[model samples]
Target: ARGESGVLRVGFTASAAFNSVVPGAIRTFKRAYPDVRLQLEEGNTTQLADELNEGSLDVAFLRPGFTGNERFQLRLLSEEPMVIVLAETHPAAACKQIALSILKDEFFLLFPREIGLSLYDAVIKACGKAGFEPKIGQLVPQISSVINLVSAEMGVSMVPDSMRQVNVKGVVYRPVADQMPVAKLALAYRRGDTSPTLRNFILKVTG
Candidate 1:
């Protein structure tokens, strides 16, 4: 804990940064502590958690959901509902809310399990609840690729509701109608971390 000016390493997922959640919080943090050096790293939940646990990052914003470790103290920032992204001309595109089961036969596009394990499992679990397994279309590296593939009529995908802001031309977003996993964002720091800068940053947004 360096007095008023010290480096703080932060990590987060694309959703946390692009969805206007982490950015807003960072803006507030900068206003309060202009001298604090903030280093930001972007990665999936797995990478973020690994870095935080290894003490490479002072704080991490990730969506661990049911896959988190007890060694970290996590604070929930938001719980966003899941939405289905489909091609604009898809039969279910016009629906205000569609059940997951309706797309049972549709090709499901998703990221690799290691990249987004929590969300991938949630989608699988939702499909199980719908009484079938999803027909996987492809596994892409980035969420943007998933959206782009969706726009190209490659397949459908489920994403956090905030992803509706992506504004992809050929894709439409619809809320999940029935019971399903809601995407979550959490701020995590190693347990017993006593860095004053980390404390200040956490308190600024989470207080």
Candidate 2:
């Protein structure tokens, strides 16, 4: 029991990265292993991946697709659908579904590329495939700021569907009608790590 009762270090990119699922997963893990302490760290994907690779964290939740580092083991946790956030008064806001091309002329509000690299690339790729380059009006570092900027009618933004739960007053989220890649959240750890604590945690999480 002593071997299993120590702290387990877990890391994640952001609240938007895991949203509700990770919090619930942590609650379930703690109920199953009451004595194991959880130490949680929040940071960017690069930082989380580095900490995971360096062995500081037993596990991590990250958005994949940056470099070719194959040293970390990764398991897909979920694929989050993307949604378009617009000002409630925007002309197309009442549409039940939006094709990406409809907003080709509208300026975009985006999170900075470094802070949300995978998502930033995905959004740009989606727009490129939709037949135009996005006209970016701002590049804020926070997802909430992106939504808030859209609420202010600065520009529209694309975000994970879960963010619709935020209830920011001036914005409305609509499902994108065109085919776009869903964002993936993964559980990651060092490739050959053999810690029993880590093994047990993985089993609990993956089961």
Best by lDDT: 1
What are the clashing pairs of model 2?
none
For each candidate in turn, the TM-score is 0.91, 0.91
**lDDT tens digits, residues 58-124, model 1?**
8988876535657789888866777788988998887887888889999999877766656677788
RMSD to truth, every model: 2.0, 1.9
Off by over 4 Å in 1: 1-3, 65-68
Candidate 2 structure quality by residue, lDDT tens digits, 1-207: 332677889887764443666776777788887888889898877888888767788898777764644777888786787788898898888889887899998989988776666677778888888888889888886666678788678989888777777778888988877575466677888887777667777777785
lDDT at position 185, candidate 1: 77
User: Which stretches of model 2 miss by more than 4 angstroms?
Assistant: 1-4, 15-18
Candidate 2, residue 17: Cα displacement in angstroms equals 4.8
